[PDB]
Amino acid sequence: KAELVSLAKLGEMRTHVGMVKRYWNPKMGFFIEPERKHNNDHFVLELQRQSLQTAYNYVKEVAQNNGQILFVGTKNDYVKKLVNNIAKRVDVAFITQRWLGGTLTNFKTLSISINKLNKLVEKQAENAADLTKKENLMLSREIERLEKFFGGVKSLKRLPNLLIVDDPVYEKNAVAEANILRIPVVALCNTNTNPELVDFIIPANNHQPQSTCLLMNLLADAVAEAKAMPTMFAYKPDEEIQIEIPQKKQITSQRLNITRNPEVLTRE
Amino acid sequence: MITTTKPIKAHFDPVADLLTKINNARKAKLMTVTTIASKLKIAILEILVKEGYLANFQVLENKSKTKRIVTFNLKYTQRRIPSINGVKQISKPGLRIYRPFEKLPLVLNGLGIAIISTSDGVMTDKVARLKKIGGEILAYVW
Amino acid sequence: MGNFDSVQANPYRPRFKRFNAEHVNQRQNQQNNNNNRFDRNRNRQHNRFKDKQ
Amino acid sequence: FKSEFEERIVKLKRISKTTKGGRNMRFSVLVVVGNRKGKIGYGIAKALEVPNAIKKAIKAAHNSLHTIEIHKGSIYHEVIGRSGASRVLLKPAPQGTGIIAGGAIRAIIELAGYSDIYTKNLGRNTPINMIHATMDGILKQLSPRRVAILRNKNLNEL
RNA sequence: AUUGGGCGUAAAGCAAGCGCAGGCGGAUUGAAAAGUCUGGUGUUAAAGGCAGCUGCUUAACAGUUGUAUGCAUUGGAAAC
RNA sequence: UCCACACCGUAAACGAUAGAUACUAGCUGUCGGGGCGAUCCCCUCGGUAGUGAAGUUAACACAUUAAGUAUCUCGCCUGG
RNA sequence: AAAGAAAACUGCCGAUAAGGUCUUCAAAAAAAAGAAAACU
Ligand SMILES: [Mg+2]
Ligand SMILES: [Mg+2]
Ligand SMILES: [Mg+2]
Ligand SMILES: [Mg+2]
Ligand SMILES: [Mg+2]
Ligand SMILES: [Mg+2]
Ligand SMILES: [Mg+2]
Ligand SMILES: [Mg+2]
Ligand SMILES: [Mg+2]
Ligand SMILES: [Mg+2]
Ligand SMILES: [Mg+2]
Ligand SMILES: [Mg+2]
Ligand SMILES: [Mg+2]
Ligand SMILES: [Mg+2]
Ligand SMILES: [Mg+2]
Ligand SMILES: [Mg+2]
Ligand SMILES: [Mg+2]
Ligand SMILES: [Mg+2]
């Protein structure tokens, strides 16, 4: 008898709209609607909810049983602040900046680095008058850099047991590391992704600052319910889900800018 | 009443035609394929479904009773990996392979199947050994 | 013959299932291995007294 | 790595690059690690010294360990392993013949656990490619229980 | 390299076409039975071959019994 | 070097890839026939290109116009 | 009163006796878990 999001809301949030047909992976035919007679790629809403429920279900056992989940979103600006918001709400590790090569497969070196970050931070907190002005400013800037590139990974001390990816295409490095190390990875495929790399695919958009935010909070909501703090969007009515469209024609999802793809410089 | 949309043509060799169709479908992960129907192809496919490499095979006829095409599907598991591993044809046109009963081959130490049509239509190698009778050897399927 | 349209359109299905919770049996097999280490040290102590008179 | 895993050298080549005057020389080792019960891996490493090359090769071999299943000590069905231009033929053998292998395959067969095995190297003589071909042949093996689950028969009965 | 290989860049696709003989050759039905499979009989000299045994002090060796391969004829099978 | 009529028959005569047949993701162009009816653009059937995964290769690379999965036939190769 | 570009340019320029090091080698490397004990 369990419920979830509403079907009218999915249609209205634009989570059933993918990308332009010119850009599409042939392996995504199962989820696509009757695109045979359709302009821009879309998805099925029933399949969407089933996939969302499965991903929701899977993340909750992990978060209740004290697993470590890692969020990596280094795409549009909105997504960085979006990923930051889940971190404030739940004490989950995050990677908002660029995914370092071998963040998971060569965890030893990055573990040493984050240990250096923590050690430098605590000495500075303890303070001394020897620090003076010049060296302190130089020291402050290295500290700033290790939080900007490791500020969300410092908490965890072992490889995460699950990954949540905003775009499997953009995070090809992250999903490859997860696949080689046999770690579950979920992603929001957008018609142009290889289904083998992702584990729990959740057919949805990725270019709309509204669809993305809605789905990311839903997964965060599973984690939040497992951690025993009140939910934000999941298992909730109409009046409280309304969200706004960010500024900076009109919010849409057409992929254009094709003129910026000429022939690779050649000739002789 | 099953409808189609594409014209159906086929290669001339009926054993390797099916073999090419099956191997290509396996490699490309395809499920539904079509080909022209012949009694040899129907009979060899019948023992194939009895030996358990393919699931269903339905032959249909035109409204005039002049053409028949057999459309078979493969038995994929839940994780989408096939049951067929490899097909290879022996008695190709030109060089026909004739082996007596005593020299009937054993495929992959008996795991695979050898297809032999001796005198009572096509028949698997194990039942051919039981009958102690041999003959034409079409292809190795494992 | 054999037609049954089973329908298995659940491809690329999830392999992982639960959150490594099956490890409950790995903790019980590690506890049983520690009890066999405590009894082996009592019997090595009793054998040092017959070779000293 | 905590197993009967034995280590052995299967080839030691001497690679070198050229710089702005002189030649940087590093030793390369091809180590085969196997517990002789069904776990075996291979590791090729390069280093400025033989001990370090060996150290890196042994570390790599234990990181990549494949699982091996045996039937009566031998291989169930004849198989040809292909890797580049190297083709290695493996054939089931009766209990008694011994390991009729030679070179990289023989090292692999002993370290894997297999006893009776008929082999012939049908291709090139570069140790890494025969082992690649050897590993491909052993990993492509089909058990007579996986085919049973697939084709739905009774364990091994006809 | 029939089993058991290749011809873009390592040897090797004729400059291209019209093409007889040759090789291969749609689907279905009937007959015949040349291929194909199988049963019976004859033969394929002896020595040698492989197995067992005996005799030489055991062996080497010798003897001993077993041990195929093909052809022809006859009686059936009808999938190619 | 040009023209007419007679020969010569070789070229990096190259896509350095014989012809025929069956199957195997997709995307971007362009050309022809056909369907609709402003062009443009959409679909179908073909020809000619680019990109591109499984697949193949020693690698470069090929990749529905294959150097992929297979069959038939011809020509050719066997160290310098 | 913007759509411009802008332009190469050439003199001459040949050769380098023979055979020759250099990777020796990985076998791989010494020691913690002990205790300790009654006796009439
Ligand atoms: Mg200099
Ligand atoms: Mg050759
Ligand atoms: Mg050549
Ligand atoms: Mg040519
Ligand atoms: Mg030529
Ligand atoms: Mg012609
Ligand atoms: Mg002719
Ligand atoms: Mg025919
Ligand atoms: Mg004789
Ligand atoms: Mg004798
Ligand atoms: Mg010439
Ligand atoms: Mg030309
Ligand atoms: Mg290309
Ligand atoms: Mg010569
Ligand atoms: Mg002058
Ligand atoms: Mg000079
Ligand atoms: Mg001179
Ligand atoms: Mg040594």
PDB file of N, CA and C (backbone and C1' of nucleotides) in Angstrom, chain F residues 1-2 4 7 11 13 16 21 28-29 31 34 39 43-44 47 52 63 65 72 77:
ATOM      1  P     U F   1      52.573  11.788 -81.488  1.00  0.00           P
ATOM      2  O5'   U F   1      51.979  12.769 -80.386  1.00  0.00           O
ATOM      3  C5'   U F   1      51.948  12.391 -79.018  1.00  0.00           C
ATOM      4  C4'   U F   1      51.739  13.588 -78.129  1.00  0.00           C
ATOM      5  C3'   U F   1      50.480  14.399 -78.394  1.00  0.00           C
ATOM      6  O3'   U F   1      49.332  13.837 -77.784  1.00  0.00           O
ATOM      7  C1'   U F   1      52.333  15.856 -78.215  1.00  0.00           C
ATOM      8  P     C F   2      48.179  13.160 -78.675  1.00  0.00           P
ATOM      9  O5'   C F   2      47.876  14.242 -79.805  1.00  0.00           O
ATOM     10  C5'   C F   2      47.127  15.411 -79.509  1.00  0.00           C
ATOM     11  C4'   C F   2      46.439  15.947 -80.738  1.00  0.00           C
ATOM     12  C3'   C F   2      45.817  14.904 -81.650  1.00  0.00           C
ATOM     13  O3'   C F   2      44.543  14.470 -81.207  1.00  0.00           O
ATOM     14  C1'   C F   2      47.087  16.420 -82.943  1.00  0.00           C
ATOM     15  P     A F   4      40.906  10.286 -85.227  1.00  0.00           P
ATOM     16  O5'   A F   4      41.171   9.622 -86.650  1.00  0.00           O
ATOM     17  C5'   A F   4      40.377   9.971 -87.773  1.00  0.00           C
ATOM     18  C4'   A F   4      40.778   9.191 -88.997  1.00  0.00           C
ATOM     19  C3'   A F   4      41.152   7.737 -88.759  1.00  0.00           C
ATOM     20  O3'   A F   4      40.025   6.885 -88.671  1.00  0.00           O
ATOM     21  C1'   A F   4      42.793   8.756 -90.118  1.00  0.00           C
ATOM     22  P     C F   7      45.808  -4.603 -86.497  1.00  0.00           P
ATOM     23  O5'   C F   7      46.451  -3.761 -85.307  1.00  0.00           O
ATOM     24  C5'   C F   7      47.188  -4.404 -84.279  1.00  0.00           C
ATOM     25  C4'   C F   7      48.673  -4.189 -84.434  1.00  0.00           C
ATOM     26  C3'   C F   7      49.500  -4.353 -83.170  1.00  0.00           C
ATOM     27  O3'   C F   7      49.793  -5.708 -82.881  1.00  0.00           O
ATOM     28  C1'   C F   7      50.132  -2.356 -84.269  1.00  0.00           C
ATOM     29  P     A F  11      53.134  -4.246 -65.518  1.00  0.00           P
ATOM     30  O5'   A F  11      53.089  -2.829 -64.792  1.00  0.00           O
ATOM     31  C5'   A F  11      52.063  -1.901 -65.105  1.00  0.00           C
ATOM     32  C4'   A F  11      52.364  -0.523 -64.581  1.00  0.00           C
ATOM     33  C3'   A F  11      51.565  -0.102 -63.356  1.00  0.00           C
ATOM     34  O3'   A F  11      52.167  -0.549 -62.151  1.00  0.00           O
ATOM     35  C1'   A F  11      51.431   1.586 -65.009  1.00  0.00           C
ATOM     36  P     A F  13      48.371   3.552 -60.409  1.00  0.00           P
ATOM     37  O5'   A F  13      48.314   2.328 -61.424  1.00  0.00           O
ATOM     38  C5'   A F  13      47.539   1.178 -61.133  1.00  0.00           C
ATOM     39  C4'   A F  13      46.416   1.006 -62.122  1.00  0.00           C
ATOM     40  C3'   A F  13      45.569  -0.242 -61.945  1.00  0.00           C
ATOM     41  O3'   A F  13      44.588  -0.096 -60.935  1.00  0.00           O
ATOM     42  C1'   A F  13      46.150   0.000 -64.221  1.00  0.00           C
ATOM     43  P     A F  16      44.231   2.666 -51.191  1.00  0.00           P
ATOM     44  O5'   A F  16      45.005   1.533 -51.997  1.00  0.00           O
ATOM     45  C5'   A F  16      44.932   0.172 -51.590  1.00  0.00           C
ATOM     46  C4'   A F  16      45.510  -0.747 -52.635  1.00  0.00           C
ATOM     47  C3'   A F  16      45.516  -2.222 -52.260  1.00  0.00           C
ATOM     48  O3'   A F  16      45.423  -3.014 -53.446  1.00  0.00           O
ATOM     49  C1'   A F  16      47.746  -1.451 -52.486  1.00  0.00           C
ATOM     50  P     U F  21      24.927 -10.657 -54.638  1.00  0.00           P
ATOM     51  O5'   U F  21      24.617 -11.788 -53.565  1.00  0.00           O
ATOM     52  C5'   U F  21      23.812 -12.904 -53.902  1.00  0.00           C
ATOM     53  C4'   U F  21      23.829 -13.933 -52.804  1.00  0.00           C
ATOM     54  C3'   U F  21      23.503 -13.431 -51.412  1.00  0.00           C
ATOM     55  O3'   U F  21      22.120 -13.237 -51.220  1.00  0.00           O
ATOM     56  C1'   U F  21      25.359 -14.871 -51.307  1.00  0.00           C
ATOM     57  P     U F  28      21.067  11.940 -37.196  1.00  0.00           P
ATOM     58  O5'   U F  28      22.347  12.643 -37.824  1.00  0.00           O
ATOM     59  C5'   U F  28      23.008  13.697 -37.143  1.00  0.00           C
ATOM     60  C4'   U F  28      24.214  14.151 -37.915  1.00  0.00           C
ATOM     61  C3'   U F  28      23.910  14.611 -39.327  1.00  0.00           C
ATOM     62  O3'   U F  28      23.430  15.941 -39.380  1.00  0.00           O
ATOM     63  C1'   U F  28      25.760  13.138 -39.354  1.00  0.00           C
ATOM     64  P     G F  29      22.179  16.300 -40.318  1.00  0.00           P
ATOM     65  O5'   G F  29      22.836  16.673 -41.718  1.00  0.00           O
ATOM     66  C5'   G F  29      23.091  15.657 -42.674  1.00  0.00           C
ATOM     67  C4'   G F  29      24.345  15.931 -43.459  1.00  0.00           C
ATOM     68  C3'   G F  29      24.148  16.047 -44.960  1.00  0.00           C
ATOM     69  O3'   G F  29      23.717  17.340 -45.349  1.00  0.00           O
ATOM     70  C1'   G F  29      25.947  14.582 -44.517  1.00  0.00           C
ATOM     71  P     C F  31      21.616  16.998 -52.238  1.00  0.00           P
ATOM     72  O5'   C F  31      21.773  15.741 -53.200  1.00  0.00           O
ATOM     73  C5'   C F  31      22.634  15.800 -54.324  1.00  0.00           C
ATOM     74  C4'   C F  31      22.610  14.518 -55.113  1.00  0.00           C
ATOM     75  C3'   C F  31      21.243  13.986 -55.507  1.00  0.00           C
ATOM     76  O3'   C F  31      20.684  14.653 -56.621  1.00  0.00           O
ATOM     77  C1'   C F  31      22.517  12.227 -54.612  1.00  0.00           C
ATOM     78  P     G F  34       9.690  10.041 -59.569  1.00  0.00           P
ATOM     79  O5'   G F  34       8.993   9.211 -58.405  1.00  0.00           O
ATOM     80  C5'   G F  34       8.345   7.983 -58.684  1.00  0.00           C
ATOM     81  C4'   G F  34       7.859   7.324 -57.422  1.00  0.00           C
ATOM     82  C3'   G F  34       6.951   8.156 -56.534  1.00  0.00           C
ATOM     83  O3'   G F  34       5.613   8.177 -57.001  1.00  0.00           O
ATOM     84  C1'   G F  34       8.605   7.110 -55.211  1.00  0.00           C
ATOM     85  P     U F  39       6.996  21.437 -50.236  1.00  0.00           P
ATOM     86  O5'   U F  39       8.292  22.354 -50.089  1.00  0.00           O
ATOM     87  C5'   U F  39       9.294  22.329 -51.099  1.00  0.00           C
ATOM     88  C4'   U F  39      10.096  23.604 -51.199  1.00  0.00           C
ATOM     89  C3'   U F  39      11.499  23.571 -50.625  1.00  0.00           C
ATOM     90  O3'   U F  39      12.448  22.937 -51.464  1.00  0.00           O
ATOM     91  C1'   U F  39      10.420  25.599 -50.026  1.00  0.00           C
ATOM     92  P     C F  43      12.510  10.815 -41.364  1.00  0.00           P
ATOM     93  O5'   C F  43      11.661   9.706 -42.128  1.00  0.00           O
ATOM     94  C5'   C F  43      10.589   9.039 -41.479  1.00  0.00           C
ATOM     95  C4'   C F  43       9.749   8.268 -42.462  1.00  0.00           C
ATOM     96  C3'   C F  43      10.510   7.339 -43.392  1.00  0.00           C
ATOM     97  O3'   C F  43      10.849   6.105 -42.782  1.00  0.00           O
ATOM     98  C1'   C F  43       8.946   8.600 -44.639  1.00  0.00           C
ATOM     99  P     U F  44      12.157   5.303 -43.260  1.00  0.00           P
ATOM    100  O5'   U F  44      11.716   4.662 -44.647  1.00  0.00           O
ATOM    101  C5'   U F  44      10.604   3.783 -44.717  1.00  0.00           C
ATOM    102  C4'   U F  44      10.258   3.460 -46.146  1.00  0.00           C
ATOM    103  C3'   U F  44      11.397   2.930 -46.999  1.00  0.00           C
ATOM    104  O3'   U F  44      11.642   1.550 -46.797  1.00  0.00           O
ATOM    105  C1'   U F  44      10.259   4.627 -48.179  1.00  0.00           C
ATOM    106  P     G F  47      23.009   0.377 -53.007  1.00  0.00           P
ATOM    107  O5'   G F  47      23.720   1.641 -53.657  1.00  0.00           O
ATOM    108  C5'   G F  47      24.007   1.683 -55.045  1.00  0.00           C
ATOM    109  C4'   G F  47      24.559   3.026 -55.444  1.00  0.00           C
ATOM    110  C3'   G F  47      25.720   3.529 -54.603  1.00  0.00           C
ATOM    111  O3'   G F  47      26.966   2.978 -54.993  1.00  0.00           O
ATOM    112  C1'   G F  47      24.127   5.255 -54.855  1.00  0.00           C
ATOM    113  P     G F  52      35.563   7.908 -34.611  1.00  0.00           P
ATOM    114  O5'   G F  52      34.384   6.956 -34.126  1.00  0.00           O
ATOM    115  C5'   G F  52      33.669   7.233 -32.932  1.00  0.00           C
ATOM    116  C4'   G F  52      32.456   6.350 -32.806  1.00  0.00           C
ATOM    117  C3'   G F  52      32.740   4.861 -32.708  1.00  0.00           C
ATOM    118  O3'   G F  52      33.090   4.447 -31.401  1.00  0.00           O
ATOM    119  C1'   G F  52      31.055   5.227 -34.314  1.00  0.00           C
ATOM    120  P     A F  63      35.111   1.172 -42.891  1.00  0.00           P
ATOM    121  O5'   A F  63      34.119   0.435 -41.887  1.00  0.00           O
ATOM    122  C5'   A F  63      33.447  -0.755 -42.275  1.00  0.00           C
ATOM    123  C4'   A F  63      32.893  -1.488 -41.082  1.00  0.00           C
ATOM    124  C3'   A F  63      31.821  -0.757 -40.291  1.00  0.00           C
ATOM    125  O3'   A F  63      30.539  -0.851 -40.882  1.00  0.00           O
ATOM    126  C1'   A F  63      33.423  -1.639 -38.804  1.00  0.00           C
ATOM    127  P     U F  65      25.619  -0.409 -46.657  1.00  0.00           P
ATOM    128  O5'   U F  65      26.918  -0.545 -47.568  1.00  0.00           O
ATOM    129  C5'   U F  65      27.149  -1.717 -48.341  1.00  0.00           C
ATOM    130  C4'   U F  65      28.561  -1.763 -48.874  1.00  0.00           C
ATOM    131  C3'   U F  65      29.661  -1.815 -47.814  1.00  0.00           C
ATOM    132  O3'   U F  65      30.744  -2.608 -48.296  1.00  0.00           O
ATOM    133  C1'   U F  65      29.955   0.102 -49.163  1.00  0.00           C
ATOM    134  P     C F  72      32.212 -23.850 -49.050  1.00  0.00           P
ATOM    135  O5'   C F  72      31.766 -23.435 -50.520  1.00  0.00           O
ATOM    136  C5'   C F  72      30.650 -24.046 -51.149  1.00  0.00           C
ATOM    137  C4'   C F  72      30.389 -23.424 -52.496  1.00  0.00           C
ATOM    138  C3'   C F  72      31.608 -23.240 -53.387  1.00  0.00           C
ATOM    139  O3'   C F  72      31.982 -24.417 -54.081  1.00  0.00           O
ATOM    140  C1'   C F  72      30.357 -21.237 -53.341  1.00  0.00           C
ATOM    141  P     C F  77      52.179 -17.801 -57.234  1.00  0.00           P
ATOM    142  O5'   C F  77      52.396 -17.446 -55.697  1.00  0.00           O
ATOM    143  C5'   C F  77      52.838 -16.152 -55.316  1.00  0.00           C
ATOM    144  C4'   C F  77      52.968 -16.019 -53.820  1.00  0.00           C
ATOM    145  C3'   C F  77      53.803 -17.077 -53.123  1.00  0.00           C
ATOM    146  O3'   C F  77      55.191 -16.827 -53.249  1.00  0.00           O
ATOM    147  C1'   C F  77      51.802 -16.715 -51.915  1.00  0.00           C
TER     148        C F  77
END
